[PDB]
């Protein structure tokens, strides 16, 4: 009866409000405030400009 829950695994998800930000060569790493919102998945990369 009511045994301790160890971990919840998500097995299916959806994505919404995808947002992109980028800076020119020389001007450091860009950022988005939603990068501080735990409900978002984010990635940092480099791209030709």
């Amino acid at each position: 009866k009511q045994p301790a829950t160890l971990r919840k695994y998500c097995i299916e998800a959806k994505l919404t409000n995808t947002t992109t930000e980028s800076r020119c060569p020389t001007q450091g790493e860009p950022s988005l405030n939603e990068e501080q919102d735990k409900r978002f998945v984010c990635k940092h990369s480099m791209v030709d400009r």
Binding site: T16, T18, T19, T20
Partner: protein, 80 residues
């Protein structure tokens, strides 16, 4: 399209019926003309949002959105 802002910068919420047409909106610095060349579909939950750079006498490369007077953010759905 609905004209709003994102951190002081102009933001365009573009709907489906605007695909293929020049986007014009007045700004203190004159009239701004952004060009949308985007998967542009119906406005829904699946949005994407990104920036349309200012481009002065330069050919566009690796982009499908750009304005010629003032950098603008754009948002549209991909649904159909």
């Amino acid at each position: 399209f609905h004209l709003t802002t994102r951190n002081g910068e102009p933001h365009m919420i573009v709907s489906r019926q605007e695909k293929g047409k020049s986007l014009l909106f007045k700004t203190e610095d004159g009239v701004n003309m952004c060009t949308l060349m985007a998967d542009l579909g119906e406005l829904c939950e699946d949005t994407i949002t990104y920036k349309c750079p200012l481009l002065r006498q330069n050919e566009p490369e690796d982009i499908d959105c750009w304005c010629n007077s003032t950098s603008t953010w754009v948002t549209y759905g991909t649904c159909t």
